[PDB]
Amino acid sequence: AHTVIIKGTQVYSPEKGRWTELGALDILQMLGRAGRPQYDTKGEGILITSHGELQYYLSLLNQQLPIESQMVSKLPDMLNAEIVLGNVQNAKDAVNWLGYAYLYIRMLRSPTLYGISHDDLKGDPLLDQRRLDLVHTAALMLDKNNLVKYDKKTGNFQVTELGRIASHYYITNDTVQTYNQLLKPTLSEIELFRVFSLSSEFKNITVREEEKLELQKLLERVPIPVKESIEEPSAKINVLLQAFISQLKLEGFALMADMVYVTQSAGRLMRAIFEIVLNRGWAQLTDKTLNLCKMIDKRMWQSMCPLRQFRKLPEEVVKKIEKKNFPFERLYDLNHNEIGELIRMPKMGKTIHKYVHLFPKLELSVHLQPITRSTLKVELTITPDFQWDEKVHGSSEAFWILVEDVDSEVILHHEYFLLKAKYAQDEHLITFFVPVFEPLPPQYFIRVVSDRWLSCETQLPVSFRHLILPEKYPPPTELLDLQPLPVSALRNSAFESLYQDKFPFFNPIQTQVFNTVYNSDDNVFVGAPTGSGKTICAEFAILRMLLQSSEGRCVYITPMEALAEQVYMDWYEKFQDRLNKKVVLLTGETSTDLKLLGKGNIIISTPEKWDILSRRWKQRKNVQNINLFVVDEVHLIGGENGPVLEVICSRMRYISSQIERPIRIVALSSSLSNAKDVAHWLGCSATSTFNFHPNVRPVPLELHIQGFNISHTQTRLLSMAKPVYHAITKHSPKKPVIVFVPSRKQTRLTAIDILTTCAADIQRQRFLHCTEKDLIPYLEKLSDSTLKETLLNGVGYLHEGLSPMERRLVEQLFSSGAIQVVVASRSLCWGMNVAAHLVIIMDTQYYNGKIHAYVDYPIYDVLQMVGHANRPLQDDEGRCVIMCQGSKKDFFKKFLYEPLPVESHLDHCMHDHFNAEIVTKTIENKQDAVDYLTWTFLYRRMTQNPNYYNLQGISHRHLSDHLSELVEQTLSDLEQSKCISIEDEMDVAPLNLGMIAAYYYINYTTIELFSMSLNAKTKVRGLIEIISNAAEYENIPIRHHEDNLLRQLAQKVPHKLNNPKFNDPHVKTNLLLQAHLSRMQLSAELQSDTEEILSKAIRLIQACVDVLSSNGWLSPALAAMELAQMVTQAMWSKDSYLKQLPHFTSEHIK
Amino acid sequence: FSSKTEWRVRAISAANLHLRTNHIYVSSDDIKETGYTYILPKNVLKKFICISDLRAQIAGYLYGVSPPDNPQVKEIRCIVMVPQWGTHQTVHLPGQLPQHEYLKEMEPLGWIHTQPNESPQLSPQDVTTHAKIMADNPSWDGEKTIIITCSFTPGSCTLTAYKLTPSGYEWGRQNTDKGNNPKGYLPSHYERVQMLLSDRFLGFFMVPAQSSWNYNFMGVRHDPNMKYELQLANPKEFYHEVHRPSHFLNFALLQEGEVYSADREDLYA
Amino acid sequence: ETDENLLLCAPTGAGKTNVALMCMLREIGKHINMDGTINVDDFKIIYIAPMRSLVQEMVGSFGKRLATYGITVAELTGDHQLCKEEISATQIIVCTPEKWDIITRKGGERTYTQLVRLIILDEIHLLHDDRGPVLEALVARAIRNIEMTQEDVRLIGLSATLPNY
Amino acid sequence: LKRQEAIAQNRRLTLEDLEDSWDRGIPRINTLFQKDRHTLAYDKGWRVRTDFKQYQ
Amino acid sequence: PRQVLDL
Amino acid sequence: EAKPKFLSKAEREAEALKRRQQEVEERQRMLEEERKKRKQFQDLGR
């Protein structure tokens, strides 16, 4: 406008609790509208204010008002935010951060106005003492308020839970101190308002006499009683908050301003109080605080109708629903006409039904399995029972899952649950561990409440009336203080020739178990932590097997293929080079497996490699005639690929009971709480079961768990990069460091992030213990340019995409001590031939794209990662920093120090074993199936943890009925798939499908689909889809950013896919098989999965040929035979027969 | 009641009822030594005291079993809060007994109710209500059912349970005078039984499914012959938001509001 | 033509939004995609305004001016989850200094920290106001991140003609 | 309890308050209504002094 | 050497 | 006993039905005993 008139220049600011002058920004913005740029050639700005305030306006609008930093008022808040974010760790970091603020610049230019004399500037030109004094003064305020743990000795700052809440919610230090002193678990709704009204944000809010009468009318109408008086500021704040929630109409301008200011800061203050209460575990206070946060944001009481959250509904209809005081859940079961008739609003009945179904409502299912006597595994399935709406719900719905005891006062397990819009109408699996006390409560409360939606909470009482908790595990075998065992304790001189230069004395675990393993012939169970030398006990058993007869046959079973490769190399140079003993490694080929087993004295193989040979142990004499069966990592039977190991171990015990010569089973594994079941299942006695504790390792393990309360995985992964560098500098500045990454892509980012944190400080290239002259020979053989850039700085990286030469070179550089930090992927924990002093486990979870959820890492993988931080002679102790989310912090603390409870999972994957046993004639009837199942670990674990296997008791009728039902269910699945034939409902026989399934080691489901999906007119075009749909490809890795790449490969393959879903592993396998057949370029991550698919592709092709051979289809058999040849040659059937030859491009074909 | 500000100060007093849960006294006198023994766990007693009212009497039906190889002692394992409204001297419980699948494994051991102040004798209203429950429900045995009175002594709580003698059951069944001194009321109508607290085991609570348990404010919605289902959940406080809907739902809607409010931008939200 | 930090001290109403648009254009012009129009998934622009009303008005002004390039302009509002979704879904993020400081303190912009290469602090004179500590903390954190992480962030400070420039 | 809630009320405890607790409390509740009471809070170790008064 | 000042 | 004998689905269902019938008969007997005890208690005061 041409003329602008600012009348009064006085605004009642609720923050100061009085009428203050207009701000500079408001005056400048108001004065900027004087004079239109189009028609006005000269503006006119009138500023009517007080005579004493005329100078401020003249200087502000005349370029005479200096910009002075006001950071002194909120110095502690800014310092707390930097400390919480990790930007500043000690006093020096805070001083450096303070130097980049406007206060430091203003303090140097104008020290007099900042409280600094000219003498101080002369004695400190850089202004370092003033920054230290300001940081110390700010740190004292933060330390006095319990915001940060600051010690005056070293100046280091420790981030506390209150500081994170205060920095996250912008709450002042005084407000945090008030919330800590006044925040109690027994605070009611009335006290919650008083605590909020006592915050430091409303310290200037005063109760004026001009509005006392109006406050009295609000005090008699507020639903929440106030123990304070009307003349106290706390009552006015509590009354203002209650009036805003109740929608009471105010009259005073000052009262309205105070209510708006109180309501605006109430949202952040309420969230901070809820976070503090939620962190403390107060279930009763958390529900009230969470309800209060939603009530303030929603501007409605919790007793009001839930339809008030949807602003599109009429108020008269909402009031009519409120007048008819009926339960909110009652409208869910009513139809559109019933809802309209119940409220007497037939016209709005359809809208009410649409609004009722659009409200968040999740159906909770509880699957509780007691892992231990004090720890229970709760698998909560959340099913969204509401129609998703972007205009009402948005991109995602935030919910909180709170686990509480019977009293509903202590939060056993609280975690955030983000319900994304793309993942609506689907069950979400939430797995967590809740503690169980000696006083077993009748039930637990699982409250899934919305984080923003009021009256949206689902309560699921997890009753423990029929919960049979496992019996208290026996104490682990104590490490007797025997004298160290010298090499002379062994008998054979040649046996001591392979350990003379290694160590003069054995470890205490080896000395205690050496007498039972080397000087004994009974089954020995050695439960010791990863790194105590369990392989030496197996070698003692191998030496015992080699002492009785020079032609012995020791069998070493490793749950991981990499462990067998590491053991095969270790065994080859020790058992073959120095003892002249045939040590061989089992392959995936059974044709060469029989020759290797018959010609080798030590047979190292995986559970899958030995299962194929052991399935026909009746015919194969080499499998039965075994003098020793070593099972390393027996604790792996409670995880993936564990049912095969349990079946192999059970088969080995059953074979040893009928061969006229027992097979000495040496079961080595981690320290397990339920070691009696493993010893009982493996035939180990009470004195031969060496089940130790995790704290008995030769190298003491210092395990530190850092909780990250970040729900998002990307933010949590990025926020832990700073902590990884801080943990390395605090735990091992000059020691090897191993960092575990959740994926192959995170290793490169983590390696650069550590370098970036190291480059931020003056300690550049501090992770390279050697010089660049000696790194040229190793850096020139690497293919990854980024690895050389990180390797030159002293920080290595490891992932599945790296070639073996690069992985071997990286391990060699780290083993020799040239490098200090190695960033290894989560999948490389088993395959790592090196150990560091400090082990970093950051983001202990993986993004499983099959279910679109962040699945936590298994305990076995974490145990191996923790075991990697074990230096026997070079390090006196071992550090392990486990950076994980706060929800899983309790799970790691229980399963890390205490023995690991292992439970067999053969009940879900017993179909393959049952078919193999039926084909071998081991199980000829239903009674034999139950008898065969009694030799496995599942039967032994069913009597100790019946609740884990859906059992109701340990009695014979319950155990016999459960085993019969499991046998009758697995047998029914085999009969329905045409794998076996059941005659008279009791006797089972092997069918054609079962023989093929158990011959090539194929899943029963794959054979059922092959037999029902293979016709007489099948071709190679449809053959790939049938092969790609086999159950063996369901374990393919689906990760983030893997759907876009597959889509690009779906338009280039020679075969189209009908209805291709990017989340289905079968589709990726078909695309990968087509890509391998066309020899097209693929990413490193895609090629890693292609090799895994190609490993089992040959067996599936052979099964298809066998299935077609029995079906009498010549055409389908020929296509399968051509596919098998084409799969090995990476060539297509539609192309010429010359692409198989190496170095032949399309030019030769043309 | 005053119904204007009396409930406010009562809720303020009721907000501090957790201070009564550590000062708990059991009247260990006049126990005949020949009856059952009742073990009320401290967690459910604490919850019942917290959710109660200093003036209005609340009541919860007691359900429990006996410990193995010990039939002479009765471990109360459940307190069933039913939709009730109570005066300062009696509780108007619904005519329907608590029926649920979780109470089938247990037997009804009586009902627990709070008293505004300690009385050396069982209230005639309490014995009349108990005997009416006897006559209307055969599943309640007079030998095993008691009336735990959690009298609100100041700054503490005194618990005294009474067992109905056959004469007391007959008189209460035949009684219709709802006053404080009905005719034919004698101290022989009840006998004090043995009770004790326990940290060894924990009970639970049963709250109504469709509605809540406190019907004192909207007692016009409370009927003696009404029907209710149960829910394995924890009961709310006496002055909870859902228990007094008239204090939160009778507000006039914001019509032509916030039109002359204060202009303040929520910079953080 | 230059990627150096700018400090424009001009009178209110003298066309300070166009200078920020030119800075946004330079950042928008760094992702051309010659075949297409612009790759908005590789960079983020933060517009810090003092008042929420100006931010609500700058979003409309930015949306109409940047409509031809397909740049999504939105206002940082709502809960932390909504703020994180809005940051990852939009390129020009206009929000108050307290809203940006709250997201930075909470960690909702950590995954989009490397993509933020241009921050515009509208009304740079607010440092003298009571909210100046938020602006100083945001500027110090952004400056500290550049000096520590080595990721260059463009700081365009627009303010009125006042002393201590 | 009453003192904290009255401090919330910002008033002083009166005679009508605590009147049900008049002759109670071993430090008698009546002693919060004495006039010298503020000076009594400066009389430390009076009980030893009384047990030593028999000695003078 | 650090001295607490009046914030 | 020690060895878990295989029970058919029909046999398992028949055993479960027999157990449920035994439990129902026990509950009915307990209800009758409770009714007798209640009658004895009522007759002791009338």
Q: Taking CB atoms and an 8 Å limit, are D5 and B19 in contact across chains?
A: no
Q: Is A1090 helix (H, G, I), strand (E, B) or coil?
A: helix
Torsions phi, psi for B124 (to 5 deg): -60, -35
Chain A residues with CB under 8 Å of B4 CB are 220
DSSP string, A183-200: --TT--HHHHHHHHHTSG
> How many angstroms separate the first and last alpha carbons of chain C?
23
Distance separating alpha carbons of residues A442 and A307, to the nearest angstrom: 35
C-alpha closest to that of A888 among A849, A922, A855, A935: A855
Q: Is there a binding annotation on residue A531?
A: yes
- Assess contact for A865 and A764: CB atoms under 8 A: no
Report which DSSP code applies to A858: P
Distance separating alpha carbons of residues A32 and A1110, to the nearest angstrom: 90
Give this entry's resolution in angstroms: 3.2
Q: Which two tokens stand for residue C129?
A: 């106001």
Distance separating alpha carbons of residues A812 and A794, to the nearest angstrom: 13
C-alpha closest to that of A1087 among A796, A803, A851: A803
Buried b (16+ CB within 10 A) or exposed e, B57-71: bbbbbbbbebeeeee
Q: Is B196 helix (H, G, I), strand (E, B) or coil?
A: strand
Q: Is there a binding annotation on residue C13?
A: yes
C-alpha distances out from residue A600 to A37, A521, A552, A583, Å: 95, 21, 9, 5
Chain B residues with CB under 8 Å of A225 CB are 7-9, 11-12
Question: Which residues contact residue B99 at a Cβ distance below 8 angstroms, ignoring those fewer than 6 apart?
Answer: B230
Shortest Cα–Cα distance, A246 to chain B (Å): 7
Distance separating alpha carbons of residues D24 and C111, to the nearest angstrom: 65
Q: Which two tokens stand for residue A1141?
A: 């030859």
Q: Taking CB atoms and an 8 Å limit, are A302 and B247 in contact across chains?
A: no
B259–chain C Cβ distance below 8 A for any pair: no
CA count, 13 A, side-chain hemisphere, F21: 6
Q: Is there a binding annotation on residue C160?
A: no
Chain E touches chain F, with at least 3 Cβ pairs below 8 Å, answer no
Question: Sheet containing C116-121: which strands, arranged edge to edge?
Answer: C6-9, C154-159, C116-121, C44-48, C92-95, C73-75
Q: Taking CB atoms and an 8 Å limit, are C127 and A66 in contact across chains?
A: no
Q: Which chain A residue's Cα is nearest to B237?
A: A188
C77–chain B Cβ distance below 8 A for any pair: yes
Q: Which two tokens stand for residue A856?
A: 């936590």
Torsions phi, psi for A455 (to 5 deg): 65, 25
Q: Which chain A residue's Cα is nearest to C165?
A: A67
DSSP string, C72-128: -EEE--SSHHHHHHHHHH-SEEEE-HHHHHHHHHHTTTGGGSSSEEEEEES-GGGGG
Instruction: Kindly report the three-state secondary structure assignment for every residue of A776-835.
Output: HHHHCCCCCHHHHHHHHCCEEECCCCCCHHHHHHHHHHHHCCCECEEEEEHHHCCCCCCC
- Give counts: helices (H), strands (E), chain E: 0, 0
C-alpha distances out from residue C124 to A24, A25, C11, C120, C162, Å: 11, 9, 12, 9, 10
Shortest Cα–Cα distance, D1 to chain B (Å): 8
C-alpha closest to that of A880 among A777, A727, A729: A727
Q: Is there a binding annotation on residue C77?
A: no
- β-bridge partners, B92: B85
Q: Is B63 helix (H, G, I), strand (E, B) or coil?
A: strand
Q: Is there a binding annotation on residue A535?
A: yes
Question: Which residues contact residue A657 at a Cβ distance below 8 angstroms, ignoring those fewer than 6 apart?
Answer: none
Q: Which two tokens stand for residue D31?
A: 């002693």
Distance separating alpha carbons of residues C16 and A25, to the nearest angstrom: 14
Q: Which two tokens stand for residue A624?
A: 């039965």
Chain A residues with CB under 8 Å of C126 CB are 25
CB nearest A73 (choices: C106, C113, C133)? C133
Question: Which residues contact residue A665 at a Cβ distance below 8 angstroms, ignoring those fewer than 6 apart?
Answer: A523, A524, A629, A630, A631, A649, A652, A653, A656, A682, A683, A684
A6–chain C Cβ distance below 8 A for any pair: no
F23–chain A Cβ distance below 8 A for any pair: no
CB neighbours of residue A365 within 10 Å: 13
- Assess contact for A665 and A656: CB atoms under 8 A: yes
Q: Taking CB atoms and an 8 Å limit, are A960 and F4 in contact across chains?
A: yes
Shortest Cα–Cα distance, C123 to chain A (Å): 7
Q: Which chain B residue's Cα is nearest to C79?
A: B269
Q: Is there a binding annotation on residue C50?
A: no
B165–chain F Cβ distance below 8 A for any pair: yes
Those chains having 3 or more beta-carbon pairs within 8 angstroms of chain D are: A, B
Residue whose token pair is 């599109």: A312
- For A316, left (φ over 0), alpha (ψ -120 to 50), or beta? alpha
Q: Outline where A281-404 has alpha helix (H).
A: 283-298, 315-323, 336-342, 346-358
Question: Which residues contact residue A388 at a Cβ distance below 8 angstroms, ignoring those fewer than 6 apart?
Answer: A421, A424, A425
Chain A residues with CB under 8 Å of F5 CB are 927, 930, 960, 964
- β-bridge partners, B163: B146, B191
A964–chain F Cβ distance below 8 A for any pair: yes
Q: Which chain B residue's Cα is nearest to F43?
A: B166
Q: Is there a binding annotation on residue C11?
A: yes
> What is the gyration radius of the CA atoms in chain A, in angstroms?
36
CB neighbours of residue B2 within 10 Å: 9
- Assess contact for C127 and A102: CB atoms under 8 A: yes
SS3 content of chain E, % helix, strand, coil (to 5): 0, 0, 100
Buried b (16+ CB within 10 A) or exposed e, A712-737: bbbbbbbbbbbbbbbbbbebbeebbb
CB nearest A930 (choices: F1, F6, F12)? F6
- Assess contact for C49 and C96: CB atoms under 8 A: yes
Question: Which residues contact residue D28 at a Cβ distance below 8 angstroms, ignoring those fewer than 6 apart?
Answer: none
CA dihedral B1, B6, B7, B12 (to 10 degrees): -150
Angle at C78 between CA C73 and CA C83, to 5 degrees: 55
Chain E residues with CB under 8 Å of A138 CB are 7
Q: Is there a binding annotation on residue A638?
A: no
Question: Which residues contact residue A510 at a Cβ distance below 8 angstroms, ignoring those fewer than 6 apart?
Answer: A485, A533, A536, A537, A540
Buried b (16+ CB within 10 A) or exposed e, A182-220: bbeebbbbbbbbbbbbbbbbbeebebeeebeebbeebbe
DSSP strand pairing (A148-150 vs A44-48): unpaired
B139–chain F Cβ distance below 8 A for any pair: yes
Q: Taking CB atoms and an 8 Å limit, are A931 and F3 in contact across chains?
A: yes
Residue type, A486: P
- Assess contact for A634 and A668: CB atoms under 8 A: yes
SS3 content of chain A, % helix, strand, coil (to 5): 45, 15, 40
Distance separating alpha carbons of residues A622 and A628, to the nearest angstrom: 12
B264–chain C Cβ distance below 8 A for any pair: no
- Assess contact for A485 and A505: CB atoms under 8 A: yes
C-alpha closest to that of B18 among B55, B45, B58, B56: B45
F1–chain A Cβ distance below 8 A for any pair: yes
Residue type, A488: S
Those chains having 3 or more beta-carbon pairs within 8 angstroms of chain B are: A, C, D, F
Chain A residues with CB under 8 Å of E4 CB are 133, 136-137, 140
Question: Which residues contact residue C108 at a Cβ distance below 8 angstroms, ignoring those fewer than 6 apart?
Answer: A715, C80, C83, C84, C87
Q: Outline where A920-1019 has alpha helix (H).
A: 926-933, 937-942, 956-976, 992-999, 1004-1013
Shortest Cα–Cα distance, A936 to chain F (Å): 13
Which residue out of B263, B264, B266, B267 would a mutagenesis test of the C interface target, given it has the greatest number of C Cβ atoms within 10 Å? B267
Question: Which residues contact residue A29 at a Cβ distance below 8 angstroms, ignoring those fewer than 6 apart?
Answer: C12, C51, C54
C54–chain B Cβ distance below 8 A for any pair: no
Distance separating alpha carbons of residues B157 and B91, to the nearest angstrom: 19
- β-bridge partners, A852: none
> What is the gyration radius of the CA atoms in chain C, in angstroms?
15
Chain B residues with CB under 8 Å of F43 CB are 166
Distance separating alpha carbons of residues B108 and B79, to the nearest angstrom: 10
Q: Is A229 helix (H, G, I), strand (E, B) or coil?
A: coil
> What is the gyration radius of the CA atoms in chain F, in angstroms?
19
DSSP strand pairing (B59-65 vs B204-208): unpaired
CB nearest A188 (choices: B7, B237, B260)? B237
Torsions phi, psi for A375 (to 5 deg): -115, 130
C-alpha closest to that of F1 among A952, A960, A968: A960
- Assess contact for A249 and A272: CB atoms under 8 A: no
Chain C residues with CB under 8 Å of A395 CB are 81-82, 85, 89
Q: Please, is A284 exposed, middle or buried when counting C-beta atoms within 10 Å of its C-beta (0-12, 13-18, 19+)?
A: buried
C-alpha closest to that of A751 among A801, A808, A790: A790
C-alpha distances out from residue A166 to A200, A263, D13, E4, Å: 12, 18, 36, 23
- Give counts: helices (H), strands (E), chain A: 46, 30
Q: Outline where A183-335 has alpha helix (H).
A: 189-197, 212-219, 233-246, 253-280, 283-298, 315-323
Shortest Cα–Cα distance, F18 to chain A (Å): 13
- Assess contact for A963 and F8: CB atoms under 8 A: no
Q: Which two tokens stand for residue A108?
A: 């140097």
Residue type, B5: T
Q: Which chain B residue's Cα is nearest to D21?
A: B154
DSSP strand pairing (A583-585 vs A602-605): parallel
CB neighbours of residue A1136 within 10 Å: 11
Question: Sheet containing A443-450: which strands, arranged edge to edge?
Answer: A411-420, A396-404, A443-450, A457-463
C-alpha closest to that of A851 among A709, A1069, A1046, A1040: A1040
CB nearest B138 (choices: F38, F44, F45)? F38
Residue whose token pair is 């879903």: A1061
DSSP string, C91-104: SEEEE-HHHHHHHH
Q: Which two tokens stand for residue A793?
A: 């700085």
- Assess contact for C22 and C96: CB atoms under 8 A: no
- Assess contact for A707 and A886: CB atoms under 8 A: yes
Chain B residues with CB under 8 Å of C78 CB are 269
Q: Taking CB atoms and an 8 Å limit, are B166 and F46 in contact across chains?
A: yes
Instruction: Tell me the technique behind this structure.
Output: cryo-EM
Chain A residues with CB under 8 Å of F15 CB are 957, 961
- For A285, left (φ over 0), alpha (ψ -120 to 50), or beta? alpha
Torsions phi, psi for A672 (to 5 deg): -115, 140
Q: Which two tokens stand for residue A481?
A: 């203080």
B36–chain F Cβ distance below 8 A for any pair: no
Torsions phi, psi for A260 (to 5 deg): -65, -45
